[PDB]
Amino acid sequence: ERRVVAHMPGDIIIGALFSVHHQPTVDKVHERKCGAVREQYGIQRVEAMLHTLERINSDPTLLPNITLGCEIRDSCWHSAVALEQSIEFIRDSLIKKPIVGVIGPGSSSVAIQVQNLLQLFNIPQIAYSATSMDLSDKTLFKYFMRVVPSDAQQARAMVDIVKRYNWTYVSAVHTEGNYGESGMEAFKDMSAKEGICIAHSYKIYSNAGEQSFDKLLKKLTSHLPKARVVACFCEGMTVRGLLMAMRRLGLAGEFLLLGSDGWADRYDVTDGYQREAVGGITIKLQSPDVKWFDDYYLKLRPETNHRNPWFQEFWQHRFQCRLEGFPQENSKYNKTCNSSLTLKTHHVQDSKMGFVINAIYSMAYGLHNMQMSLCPGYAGLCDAMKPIDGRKLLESLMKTNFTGVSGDTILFDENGDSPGRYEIMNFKEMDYINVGSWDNGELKMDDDEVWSKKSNIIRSVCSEPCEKGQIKVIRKGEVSCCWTCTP
Amino acid sequence: ERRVVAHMPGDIIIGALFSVHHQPTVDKVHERKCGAVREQYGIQRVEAMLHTLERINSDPTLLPNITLGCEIRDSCWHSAVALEQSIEFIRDSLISKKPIVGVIGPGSSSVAIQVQNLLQLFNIPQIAYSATSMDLSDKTLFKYFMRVVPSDAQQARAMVDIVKRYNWTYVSAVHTEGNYGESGMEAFKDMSAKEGICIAHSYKIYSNAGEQSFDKLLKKLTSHLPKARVVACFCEGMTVRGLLMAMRRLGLAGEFLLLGSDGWADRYDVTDGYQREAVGGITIKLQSPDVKWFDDYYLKLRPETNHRNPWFQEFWQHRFQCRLEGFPQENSKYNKTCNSSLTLKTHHVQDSKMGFVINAIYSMAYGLHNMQMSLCPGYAGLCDAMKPIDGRKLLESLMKTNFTGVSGDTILFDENGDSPGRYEIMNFKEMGKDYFDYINVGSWDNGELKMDDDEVWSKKSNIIRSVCSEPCEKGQIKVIRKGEVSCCWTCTPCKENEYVFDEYTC
Numbered sequence: 007e008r009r010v011v012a013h014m015p016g017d018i019i020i021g022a023l024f025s026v027h028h029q030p031t032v033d034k035v036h037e038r039k040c041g042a043v044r045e046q047y048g049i050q051r052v053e054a055m056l057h058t059l060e061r062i063n064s065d066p067t068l069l070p071n072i073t074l075g076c077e078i079r080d081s082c083w084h085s086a087v088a089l090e091q092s093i094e095f096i097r098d099s100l101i102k103k104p105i106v107g108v109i110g111p112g113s114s115s116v117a118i119q120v121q122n123l124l125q126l127f128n129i130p131q132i133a134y135s136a137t138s139m140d141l142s143d144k145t146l147f148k149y150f151m152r153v154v155p156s157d158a159q160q161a162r163a164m165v166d167i168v169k170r171y172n173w174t175y176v177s178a179v180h181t182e183g184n185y186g187e188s189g190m191e192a193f194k195d196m197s198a199k200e201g202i203c204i205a206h207s208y209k210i211y212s213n214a215g216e217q218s219f220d221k222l223l224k225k226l227t228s229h230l231p232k233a234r235v236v237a238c239f240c241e242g243m244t245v246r247g248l249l250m251a252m253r254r255l256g257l258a259g260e261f262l263l264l265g266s267d268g269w270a271d272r273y274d275v276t277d278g279y280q281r282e283a284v285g286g287i288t289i290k291l292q293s294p295d296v297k298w299f300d301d302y303y304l305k306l307r308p309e310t311n312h313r314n315p316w317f318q319e320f321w322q323h324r325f326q327c328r329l330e331g332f333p334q335e336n337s338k339y340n341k342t343c344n345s346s347l348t349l350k351t352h353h354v355q356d357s358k359m360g361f362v363i364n365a366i367y368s369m370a371y372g373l374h375n376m377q378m379s380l381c382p383g384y385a386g387l388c389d390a391m392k393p394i395d396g397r398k399l400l401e402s403l404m405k406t407n408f409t410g411v412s413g414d415t416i417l418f419d420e421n422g423d424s425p426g427r428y429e430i431m432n433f434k435e436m437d438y439i440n441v442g443s444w445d446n447g448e449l450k451m452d453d454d455e456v457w458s459k460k461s462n463i464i465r466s467v468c469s470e471p472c473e474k475g476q477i478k479v480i481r482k483g484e485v486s487c488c489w490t491c492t493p
Numbered sequence: 494e495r496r497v498v499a500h501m502p503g504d505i506i507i508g509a510l511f512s513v514h515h516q517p518t519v520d521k522v523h524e525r526k527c528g529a530v531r532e533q534y535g536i537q538r539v540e541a542m543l544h545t546l547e548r549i550n551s552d553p554t555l556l557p558n559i560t561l562g563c564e565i566r567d568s569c570w571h572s573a574v575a576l577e578q579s580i581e582f583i584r585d586s587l588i589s590k591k592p593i594v595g596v597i598g599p600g601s602s603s604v605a606i607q608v609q610n611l612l613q614l615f616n617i618p619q620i621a622y623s624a625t626s627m628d629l630s631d632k633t634l635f636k637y638f639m640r641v642v643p644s645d646a647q648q649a650r651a652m653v654d655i656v657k658r659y660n661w662t663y664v665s666a667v668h669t670e671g672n673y674g675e676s677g678m679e680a681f682k683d684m685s686a687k688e689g690i691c692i693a694h695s696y697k698i699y700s701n702a703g704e705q706s707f708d709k710l711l712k713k714l715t716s717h718l719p720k721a722r723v724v725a726c727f728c729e730g731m732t733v734r735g736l737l738m739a740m741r742r743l744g745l746a747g748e749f750l751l752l753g754s755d756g757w758a759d760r761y762d763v764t765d766g767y768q769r770e771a772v773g774g775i776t777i778k779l780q781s782p783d784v785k786w787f788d789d790y791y792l793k794l795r796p797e798t799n800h801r802n803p804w805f806q807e808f809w810q811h812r813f814q815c816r817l818e819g820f821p822q823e824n825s826k827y828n829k830t831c832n833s834s835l836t837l838k839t840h841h842v843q844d845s846k847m848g849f850v851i852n853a854i855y856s857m858a859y860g861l862h863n864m865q866m867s868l869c870p871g872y873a874g875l876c877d878a879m880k881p882i883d884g885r886k887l888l889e890s891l892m893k894t895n896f897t898g899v900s901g902d903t904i905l906f907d908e909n910g911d912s913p914g915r916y917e918i919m920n921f922k923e924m925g926k927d928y929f930d931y932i933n934v935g936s937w938d939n940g941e942l943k944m945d946d947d948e949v950w951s952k953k954s955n956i957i958r959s960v961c962s963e964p965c966e967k968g969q970i971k972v973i974r975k976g977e978v979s980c981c982w983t984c985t986p987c988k989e990n991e992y993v994f995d996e997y998t999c
């Protein structure tokens with residue numbers, strides 16, 4: 007109740023919807039009472055927003071004589087609360103200091119709802135983790151950009167990997183959802199057009215159980231001789247459940263798991279089942295650590311950081327102590343916060359931190375190019391920039407081309423989507439180790455590191471090529487890659 | 494004469510009078526045979542017209558589903574030829590094909606006066622891009638005249654507020670006699686006198702005499718050396734250079750402060766090689782940024798491709814002093830032949846008032862758009878109320894027009910069809926090893942005068958004082974009206990038995 011907002015003043019104010027708290031319980035959905043505080047998706051991304059705007063105001067090349075402000079609201083990873091705060095943006099325009107554009111939110115569905123709201127008022131929205139290829143349609147989501155690649159780009163990466171190693175007959179398993187269905191149908195179309203055959207579409211949920219995973223493993227073994235590669239558009243723990251199935255049913259290394267981004271180099275899926283895990287090839291989303299972010303965030307102190315209102319709550323929650331003498335001091339904590347406490351103690355940077363920073367820079371560069379166009383000779387905001395036109399800002403943001411925080415030359419296509427830049431990992435008995443890269447179609451790889459020799463490359467084919475004497479290829483009737491050699 | 498016209502088709506056609514050629518020789522004024530081609534005032538402004546109409550037709554927000562055409566005629570900077578071409582405008586208007594809705598230009602203020610006197614007879618709105626003379630401010634006499642440039646009176650107001658800001662009560666005045674000197678000087682006199690500033694004397698000097706008259710006038714200016722030191726200069730370009738040559742000759746090196754006009758704003762040919770006496774002067778420059786997209790268009794042009802501009806072959810041959818072999822408009826008497834490597838980027842200088850030409854074209858376009866939005870509310874193109882366009886209605890729309898210019902300016906016209914003044918103040922300072930340069934010191938935006946006080950002067954003591962009489966002691970004031978000047982008094986002791994009635998008499 008009476009939600010707080012971390013807002014920074016400036017000549018231009020950019021809205022931000024971060025997931026500071028967890029989504030409310032099933033009970034309080036009609037009440038909108040968020041859960042515990044979130045470290046990575048919350049406080050870290052809020053501080054990223056704040057310090058990135060500070061660093062952008064510091065830069066004299068980008069937006070000179072203009073101050074960038076923000077208004078950071080808690081989305082709580084739930085469509086309803088995000089809609090509440092987006093409505094607060096829409097009314098807070100009212101025309102103090104209207105919101106030019108919104109950053110986020112996290113979830114793709116929550117992003118869809120926030121976009122359906124914002125496009126009604128011509129407010130450009132840039133996402134940092136919304137990947138579902140439903141948002142690629144710009145007739146339905148006119149003002150939606152994103153610095154992350156769609157799920158279709160990842161399915162394209164898997165298609166070209168299966169292509170490169172001449173795997174014509176492959177099985178398919180996906181975690182059913184708005185990600186499984188999407189990635190799997192994109193993979194099906196792309197593979198079928200490239201000349202690859204699928205056994206059929208297998209869907210397994212993560213919370214099925216330790217018997218449905220075994221039934222699905224047997225349904226996958228029902229194609230044991232011909233197919234050996236299982237294209238896996240799967241969540242994180244779905245791969246661990248299938249590795250537990252490989253342990254149970256004793257299929258140790260009888261199949262090749264082409265892992266998705268859910269299982270990229272995340273140890274918690276393999277550890278203690280590393281036996282069956284060896285051999286798998288996984289797609290990881292290339293995300294380097296933003297050094298200067300860590301340098302800023304790890305120095306923070308609740309004694310000093312007052313602009314982030316959730317930082318006192320976060321300090322008490324992370325260290326399970328009580329910030330004695332502070333305004334947001336909470337009881338029910340037995341221990342008291344020691345002055346030695348530091349954020350460096352077991353610090354893990356946010357998964358997609360680089361993408362949050364890149365989206366903030368995307369908004370900043372769009373505003374800067376709009377100022378350079380509308381106000382040619384002016385340094386700050388001339389009368390064409392007062393007020394900023396949402397339509398014109400969108401026009402500029404669609405054209406935006408800049409070099410990201412990690413060296414990426416990030417730019418948006420006609421559909422407001424960003425190019426895919428993944429790195430391929432192989433789980434080898436030495437750990438996930440890098441084996442190649444995928445840059446928007448350009449697939450380079452270390453062929454003689456995933457396999458020792460050219461003979462070791464597992465073959466996945468339904469029917470062997472017909473004899474030079476006995477050539478006549480005849481379609482059996484069930485699959486296109488299964489023929490009968492007749493005279 | 495069979496003059497050629499650069500015309501572009503459209504649903505609405507806008508006339509334009511640009512100065513493609515020089516004005517005819519004194520002999521051929523009754524013959525109307527124009528001179529050499531002009532790069533900046535000519536070809537550049539013609540291409541500006543054409544490409545600006547292209548870019549406006551590209552915009553779906555401004556005039557959607559309507560095509561803007563034009564008819565670009567050579568005014569030759571001479572009243573007679575401009576009247577000829579304006580007559581062709583008004584007659585193919587009367588005949589209907591494709592009447593001329595409005596005219597852009599011309600350049601000269603006198604030629605603008607004549608063209609306006611012609612056009613207003615047929616209710617054709619005219620927008621000027623360089624006609625500044627404040628004679629055109631009267632709308633009872635020039636009912637259909639707009640202009641995106643400020644009047645000369647706005648510039649005199651800028652000088653008045655500059656003299657005001659630095660407490661310069663007693664200043665001398667010099668102007669180049671003409672339709673600009675007289676105007677600016679009388680406006681300055683009225684404004685200064687109302688603000689509380691006195692004039693030492695108003696000297697008028699012509700640009701063509703000199704080397705004796707400049708020295709006599711410099712001596713007449715020195716006849717007030719101690720009291721007055723600031724000389725408000727409503728002067729042409731080379732008049733300031735003549736006065737700097739006088740300062741060189743008579744050895745008055747930095748004995749006076751020259752408050753320069755737009756004739757000498759950052760115009761180097763006035764200072765160069767006399768930069769010694771030029772240092773210190775404060776000049777008003779008309780803020781004109783470079784139109785990037787214009788250059789991007791113009792510098793790519795090629796006579797092999799550009800056929801819509803008929804003068805482009807002549808211009809290509811003249812600028813590069815070569816011969817366009819194999820072309821229809823190929824001219825002899827050129828010894829060299831045109832190389833295929835030749836580019837317009839070679840020593841390119843954008844037109845002085847290019848932004849204003851583009852802003853005038855946009856003014857006409859936005860006026861037409863607002864007229865279409867009013868007459869035809871739901872319609873996209875031209876309904877029957879827009880067929881035909883009423884000159885009176887178009888004028889009504891253009892007077893109310895308010896839009897954001899090419900450079901971010903909020904261009905709008907007042908009740909007198911004049912635009913707000915947006916000037917920038919320059920100071921000629923010695924910047925290091927023999928590097929003399931005009932440097933920005935502040936801005937004047939229709940009354941709002943911002944400035945960098947501690948950059949034109951190092952300290953508050955360095956600010957030159959220009960005052961006739963020092964303030965009288967508070968006890969014994971008795972300021973005496975001599976009878977000749979309004980603010981030049983003599984401080985006298987008030988009679989011991991008399992009382993201090995006011996600050997003027999006892």
Ligand SMILES: *[C@@H]1O[C@H](CO)[C@@H](O)[C@H](O)[C@H]1NC(C)=O
Pocket residue numbers: 066070071385
């Ligand atoms: C504008 O920016 C310059 C640096 O580029 C700075 O020196 C100046 O103080 C700024 N002025 C305003 C009014 O922001």
Ligand SMILES: *[C@@H]1O[C@H](CO)[C@@H](O)[C@H](O)[C@H]1NC(C)=O
Pocket residue numbers: 407408417
């Ligand atoms: C992106 O911008 C750079 C300049 O920083 C330019 O060289 C490059 O061609 C641009 N690329 C695209 C695709 O616009």
Ligand SMILES: *[C@@H]1O[C@H](CO)[C@@H](O)[C@H](O)[C@H]1NC(C)=O
Pocket residue numbers: 557558873
């Ligand atoms: C206006 O022009 C567009 C093309 O830009 C065309 O599709 C549309 O049909 C036109 N509208 C009318 C009413 O003619």
Ligand SMILES: *[C@@H]1O[C@H](CO)[C@@H](O)[C@H](O)[C@H]1NC(C)=O
Pocket residue numbers: 658659660956
């Ligand atoms: C002008 O005089 C007033 C006092 O009448 C003073 O306050 C002001 O600073 C002066 N301005 C300048 C530029 O000297």
Ligand SMILES: *[C@@H]1O[C@H](CO)[C@@H](O)[C@H](O)[C@H]1NC(C)=O
Pocket residue numbers: 832833834
């Ligand atoms: C054309 O230009 C090139 C480069 O400027 C020059 O080397 C060449 O000699 C020129 N050709 C003629 C015929 O002058």
Ligand SMILES: *[C@@H]1O[C@H](CO)[C@@H](O)[C@H](O)[C@H]1NC(C)=O
Pocket residue numbers: 893894895905
């Ligand atoms: C802009 O134009 C409108 C015409 O409707 C006028 O009322 C308004 O005063 C103009 N803006 C300014 C700042 O004068």
Ligand SMILES: [Mg+2]
Pocket residue numbers: 062063064065066068069070071072
């Ligand atoms: Mg900045």
